[PDB]
Amino acid sequence: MTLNITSKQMDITPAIREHLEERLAKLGKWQTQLISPHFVLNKVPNGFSVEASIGTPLGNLLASATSDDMYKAINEVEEKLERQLNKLQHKSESRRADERLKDSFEN
Numbered sequence: 001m002t003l004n005i006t007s008k009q010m011d012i013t014p015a016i017r018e019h020l021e022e023r024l025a026k027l028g029k030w031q032t033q034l035i036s037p038h039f040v041l042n043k044v045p046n047g048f049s050v051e052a053s054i055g056t057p058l059g060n061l062l063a064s065a066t067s068d069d070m071y072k073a074i075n076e077v078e079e080k081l082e083r084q085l086n087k088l089q090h091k092s093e094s095r096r097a098d099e100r101l102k103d104s105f106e107n
Contacts, residue, residue, distance in 0.1 A: 003024035005038070005040075007041045027054075032057075032061075032088065033057060035055030049064070056088055058088035062081075063080030
């Protein structure tokens, strides 16, 4: 799984690329398997607007932030993505009748 980029304007470079990639590799340790990962990176006069979009067997990941701090914006996105990630693994703790932690045959 490789974190792909789109970047409507500012092209991708070692920094971003390595950053996003590093972030993905960092999110790899997380209870998830990035089902085709992307990163919609963007900039603007008032700062930098970033938006991430990854996939997970538990739920597609998405995020977006705007700030005058590139890596901080990314810093934020990763926070969202992570937050959602934790949300995925978290989810409802009472799905009607719960799922229980039993497994062996189911029959």
